[PDB]
Design a protein around this ligand. Sequence first.
Ligand SMILES: O=c1[nH]c2ccccc2nc1/C=C\c1cccs1
Lengths: 273, 9
Amino acid sequence: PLESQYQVGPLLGSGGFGSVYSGIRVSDNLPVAIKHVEKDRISDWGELPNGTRVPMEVVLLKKVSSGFSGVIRLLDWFERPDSFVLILERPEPVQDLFDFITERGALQEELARSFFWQVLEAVRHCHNCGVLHRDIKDENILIDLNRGELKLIDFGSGALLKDTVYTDFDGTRVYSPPEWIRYHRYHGRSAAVWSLGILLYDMVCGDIPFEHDEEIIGGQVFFRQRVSSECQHLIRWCLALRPSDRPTFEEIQNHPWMQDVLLPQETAEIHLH
Amino acid sequence: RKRRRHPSG
Ligand SMILES: O=c1[nH]c2ccccc2nc1/C=C\c1cccs1
């Protein structure tokens, strides 16, 4: 029973993802986050091996929560009459990357390189586990400020990864690719790479490049901060209008701008402590 | 200029 295993603290946030509380597992005082999702609000459903009908978000989290990774891991979950409750890891101290960029402004390229590298490794892990997040953005990335490690959250818009076309989408429109805007069609990996280009611009310029549909489909990336030529090239490559012109994850991580990445501990000591 | 969050889900 959920009520006796966890002590519930303050609300951390609420929105399309449900309501999330700070918590502590009474068994070992382990810090957790406690996410409540209303059953009426669950779009896609899935099945566990046991055949239990659960939100898709639980299926996806289970697929990516084995072993260590840059994903906030699902530790347990419960069904209630009108909702599901998810028990998630809670690193401490933590700040999401949206708030971090708001407070710090455009990030030094060394710091953006370290963050972006870790996001790539986490997204690779998801895809290797058969999971497409479909809502990569700074808001859905937590920074462990002491360890210098980034963690993906909020798989509520995600899907099982497939090689055929997607025609549904409930992620963030300003991170969505022009083929979705124009045709309501996209493929998983190339749409993910588009959102990663948006994210990288966001890091190095201090905000996302596009706010309107016309800008998303227009194909013009104006740089509002000084950004190195190598970094601009990688961003513009990720934001190629034609999906097949975008880099693979391998090509991103082999890009000249991505070389000589800092370790997480170095990232924390230089930029976060 | 105004930086803002963008809801999803
Ligand atoms: O899945 C999560 N969704 C959140 C949405 C809004 C606010 C907080 C959220 N924290 C989550 C997970 C884990 C956390 C670990 C440490 C802080 S939050």
